[PDB]
Structures are given as C-alpha cells and as structure tokens.
From a paper:
The antitoxin, RelB, both binds and inhibits RelE, and regulates transcription through operator binding and conditional cooperativity controlled by RelE. Binding of RelB inhibits RelE by displacement of the C-terminal, flexible α-helix, which contains a tyrosine residue (Tyr87) that is critical for catalysis (Li et al., 2009). RelB is additionally known to dimerize through formation of a ribbon-helix-helix (RHH) DNA binding motif that allows transcriptional autoregulation through binding to the relO operator region (Li et al., 2008; Overgaard et al., 2009).
Two additional crystal structures of isolated RelE further show that the C-terminal helix uses this motif to adopt multiple, defined conformations. To better assess the structural rearrangements that take place in RelE upon RelB binding, we determined the structures of isolated RelE present in the two crystal forms obtained for the isolated toxin (P21 and P212121). The structure of the P21 form was previously resolved at 2.5 Å (Neubauer et al., 2009). However, reinvestigation of this structure using better data collected to 1.8 Å revealed that although one of the three molecules in the ASU is indeed in the monomeric form reported earlier, the two other molecules dimerize via a symmetrical domain-swap interaction involving helix α3. The most common interaction is characterized by a strong salt bridge between Arg93 and Glu14 in addition to multiple contacts between hydrophobic residues such as Val86 and Tyr87 (left).
Author numbering: 2 to 95
C-alpha cells in the first residue's frame, strides 16, 4: 500500500467539500491507497496522474503517484465542469 499526502491547496478543497461528497470520495481514495495505479483512471498528459470520479456530483479528485516516496499525492479536488479540476491540477504540478 501507499502513504497519502495532500497539496496544501488540495487539502483546503477537501475540507470545504460537502459531507456526502467527501465521504464518497473518501471511500474511493482509501481504496486507491491499496493500489493506486488504476489504468482505467489514468489521465492523459503528464505521467503518473489519475482521477477519482463520481457518477453524479460531478466532483473529481486528481492525484499523482510518486513511487520514490511510496506516496499518493492529492493535487486537486473540485469540479469537472469546464475542466476546472484538471486545469488546476496541471497548474499546481508545474
């Protein structure tokens, strides 16, 4: 299993999340820690990035897998609408 870390800005997003949505993402995030490279969820663009999707929120969590630190690094949590959550993730990695 992998350890967990958050970007400072991503952790704030996490705590601002509504209760029901956070719990939904939390269950999936905990599953992710057991084995975080889930090829179906791999994001295009820079390597080692994956998403967690909800069927109808439509909130998203973006994380980077960092093997050298055995860590899942949460970089962005927010809305898929207008690709907000994804553009922020790229911005925070650069």
């Amino acid at each position: 299993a992998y350890f967990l870390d958050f970007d400072e800005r991503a952790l704030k997003e996490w705590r601002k999340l509504g209760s029901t949505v956070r719990e939904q993402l939390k269950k999936k995030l905990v599953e992710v820690l057991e084995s975080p490279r889930i090829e179906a969820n791999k994001l295009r663009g820079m390597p080692d990035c994956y998403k967690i999707k909800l069927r109808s929120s439509g909130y998203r969590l973006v994380y980077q897998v960092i093997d050298e630190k055995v860590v899942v690094f949460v970089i962005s949590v927010g809305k898929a609408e207008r690709s907000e959550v994804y553009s922020e993730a790229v911005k925070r990695i650069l």
